[PDB]
Amino acid sequence: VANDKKPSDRIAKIAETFVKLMNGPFKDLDPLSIEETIERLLFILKVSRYTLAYSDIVLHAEHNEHWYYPGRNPTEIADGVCEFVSDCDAEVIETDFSNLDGRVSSWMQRNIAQKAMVQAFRPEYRDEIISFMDTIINTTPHNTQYNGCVEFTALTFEHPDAEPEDLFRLIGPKCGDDGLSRAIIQKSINRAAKCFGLELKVERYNPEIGLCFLSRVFVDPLATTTTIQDPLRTLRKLHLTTRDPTIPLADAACDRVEGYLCTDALTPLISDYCKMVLRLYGPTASTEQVRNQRRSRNKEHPQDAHLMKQVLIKRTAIDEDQVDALIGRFAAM
């Protein structure tokens, strides 16, 4: 659903200041060769060749590590999240956007992303990048840029008397559709989204139900960095498999449970399901080398185990006796 909601006059100066702060000290850049882009990490290649270099140079710089979390290993993500929650003393807010790529306006697209790319890249490459942006208007970096712009707008609205550089220095971790911010702008974020024309969903941090971030649940971010898959999103749908019909059910289930072990080995109410899938569909599945040579293969802390159990129960609103009964039923099947 395309939208053409231009922002107000005042917000334009805030957006320009945010873009300039994003530019930082990297005035000049050069495009990457086709071979280097191909070995990095059709239609994706032509934009990737420039966008990967732009991200790696500007968005992964010294003065842009405060907010651009997108682009780091999951261990690095967990470390950053724990550091941010320690800094904010467990006072953080979560942002959940609905169809951001389908809702970003033309003015935002042509005044944030296009401006940033043109300022980052060399003048001799202006035509190619502008043509690529025009083709885009009619991937990953766009969401991060939108999140950074919205964070800058919120910070500018919260403290209009501070210098833009100091305001932007407080930008918290942001990664695409998910991000973190101070809880003091919980109500003012909705007005900023309305001014830009975006829809924002915000939820106050609650230790009883855990914290939601990148479909990951932090059981107790104050002390431990233990983290698990989001139970709210996956439990209601994990019993149904959305793989293509051509794949046997056993191979898809095996890949799903292998990923779950790789990410959620010691999570209550999921380990039992994964083990029962491995016990039932496991022997009936095909050879694992066969599925490793098949395209659809990629189409999918012990100390606080008690606390993780209680946090999962709080997340799923299931009584402990009910949880034990469910665990017994799952294991005995």
Q: Is 107 helix (H, G, I), strand (E, B) or coil?
A: helix
Q: 320-332 vs 271-284: helix axis angle to the nearest 10?
A: 10
DSSP 9-70: HHHHHHHHHHHHHHHTT-----PPPHHHHHH----HHHHHHHHHHHIIIIITSGGGTTTB-S
Q: Which two tokens stand for residue 267?
A: 């999570």
Strand-pair partners of 181: 93
Q: Provide, for the chain, the percentages of residues in helix, strand and coil under a 3-state DSSP scheme, each rounded to the nearest 5.
A: 60, 10, 35
Q: Which helix (H) or strand (E) holds 213?
A: strand 211-213
Which is catalytic among the residues 28, 56, 134, 177? 177
Query: How many Cα atoms are found within 13 Å in the side-chain-facing hemisphere of 268?
Result: 24
- DSSP class per residue in 283-330: HHS--HHHHHTSGGGG---GGGHHHHHHHHHHHHT--HHHHHHHHHHH
Quick one: tokens of 310? 């209680």
Strand 211-213, strand 174-175: pairing: unpaired
Q: How far apart are the first and last CA of the chain?
A: 46
Catalytic-residue membership of 30 = no
Tokens 């990951």 sit on residue: 216
Active site residues: 177
